[PDB]
Design a protein around this ligand. Structure first.
Ligand SMILES: Cc1ccc(OCC(=O)N2CCOCC2)c(C)c1
Length: 460
């Protein structure tokens, strides 16, 4: 029975509003309602992996798992296996997979981050899960960020705290945060970004939603505007939104948006907003295609509607050769030519690189580069032709061309990373000098660039 080169992944996010779910929630897992929806002809075809993020979840883990498994079994006639479940306060993540995937899944990690300080510590934060699916690493983050229309900068801070401190994936990738540790990273939840229009425009916004005219609302969505200004979720993707705002509804109908200030809201307005979102980041040139992104219309126990997103995701097999794993394959080599880093830093330490990849036996530390002054007042660190030749464990091009090299540029004085990035080995040619490029980030913000040429030797 062959190993897959593609799987499908369901991502769900639902802020349950502290209420139990209705008896039927199958529309969520079928990607039916508003937006980009799944074709009826696929209804019986199970996804490989289902990842369910809840916020304001009032259920026990047992209660919710029973509902989820019975829902999927009704749809698919498949009894899913529980990969992971992790809850922080009322924020929860569940990972279910087809039973045929049980021996494909390993290295399961869970973690949480609590955001805020004092007043603001005690109900917001994130839960996450990571694991290996054959040769592919998968990470999943469910975050419930700070609420309120005037707190977008707090949400951005919550995002940075979560990606700095959530401890998922391979701990040997010590310079790298979760935005570089996975082949595919999915980040979803009640991100709580609002449509930034005046309170006086509430009824106008409602009108627009009734007309399915979302363009003038999406142009004020705080998450889209913050992402365009590179304030949050740098280098993440989001499918186009074609569904109505998923917050704030009167419960037990979807006919009414409840936006007016009440004692129960702390006398805050809740204009209709896309609070409930799914974003992703995959390594360069890895197949990832969003096949649905929408909201349900028929689950009305909460003041939020559930959101679904589904993806085709490229995966690779657990490769064995006669040589690696357990030795190098001398028919393989990775050379970096004429490389230089450009850094936004004011510092004047010397810098060195670290190369990390599961195609290496262990990470590789370069010599220090040569600092020069850039024309427009930046630091250029030149490595020339000084970089160590990397010795992959397997030379077969069917393996090596699917791999990636993570790069960290570190201070010689402090050994701290000033920037992290990723280079694909999915090249147009082997035995050929070819341009490479990655942006560099640290704590998920832009700190520079790395560019140069690569020359990849495979056994072919
Ligand atoms: C499909 C699959 C499911 C679980 C699993 O390992 C983890 C496990 O067995 N757990 C017990 C129940 O709670 C979560 C942890 C693996 C390797 C594959």
């Amino acid at each position: 029975q062959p190993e897959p080169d593609m799987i499908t992944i369901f991502i769900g996010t639902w802020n349950m509003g502290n209420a139990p779910p209705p008896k039927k929630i199958t529309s969520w897992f079928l990607s039916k309602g508003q937006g980009k929806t799944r074709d009826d002809s696929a209804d019986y075809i199970p996804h490989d992996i289902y990842v369910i993020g809840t916020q304001e979840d009032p259920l026990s883990e047992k209660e919710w798992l029973e509902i989820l498994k019975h829902s999927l079994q009704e749809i698919t006639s498949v009894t899913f296996k529980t990969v992971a479940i992790h809850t922080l306060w009322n924020i929860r993540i569940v990972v279910l997979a087809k039973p045929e995937h049980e021996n494909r899944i390993s290295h399961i990690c869970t973690d949480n981050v609590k955001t805020g300080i004092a007043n603001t510590l005690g109900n917001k934060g994130a839960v996450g899960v990571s694991f290996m699916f054959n040769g592919t690493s998968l990470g999943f983050v469910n975050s419930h960020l700070t609420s309120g229309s005037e707190k977008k900068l707090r949400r951005n801070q919550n995002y940075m705290n979560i990606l700095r401190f959530l401890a998922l994936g391979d701990k040997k990738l010590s310079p790298f945060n979760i935005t570089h540790r996975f082949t595919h990273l999915f980040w979803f939840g009640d991100l709580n970004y609002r449509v930034d229009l005046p309170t006086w425009e509430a009824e106008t916004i409602i009108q627009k939603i009734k007309q399915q005219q979302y363009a003038d609302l999406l142009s004020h969505d705080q998450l889209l505007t913050e992402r365009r200004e590179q304030k949050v979720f740098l280098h993440f993707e989001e499918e186009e939104i074609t569904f109505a705002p998923t917050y704030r509804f009167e419960r037990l109908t979807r006919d009414k948006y409840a936006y007016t200030k009440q004692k129960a809201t702390g006398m805050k307005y809740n204009l209709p907003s896309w609070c409930d979102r799914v974003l992703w980041k995959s390594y360069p040139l890895v197949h990832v295609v969003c096949q649905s992104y929408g909201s349900t219309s028929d689950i009305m126990t909460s003041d939020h509607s559930p959101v679904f997103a589904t993806f085709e995701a490229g995966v690779t097999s657990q490769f064995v050769s006669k040589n690696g794993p357990g030795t190098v394959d001398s028919q393989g080599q990775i050379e970096f030519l004429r490389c230089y880093a450009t850094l936004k830093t004011k510092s004047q330490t010397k810098f060195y690189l670290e190369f990390h990849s599961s195609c290496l036996e262990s990470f590789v530390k370069s010599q220090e580069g040569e600092n020069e002054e850039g024309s427009e007042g930046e630091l250029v660190v030149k490595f020339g032709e000084t970089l160590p030749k990397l010795k992959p464990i397997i030379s077969d091009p069917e393996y090596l061309l699917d791999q990636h090299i993570l790069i960290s540029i570190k201070s010689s004085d402090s050994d701290e990373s000033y920037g992290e990035g990723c280079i694909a080995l999915r090249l147009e040619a082997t035995e050929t000098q070819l341009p490479i490029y990655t942006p560099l980030t640290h704590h998920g913000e832009l700190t520079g660039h790395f560019q140069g040429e690569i020359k990849l030797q495979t056994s072919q």
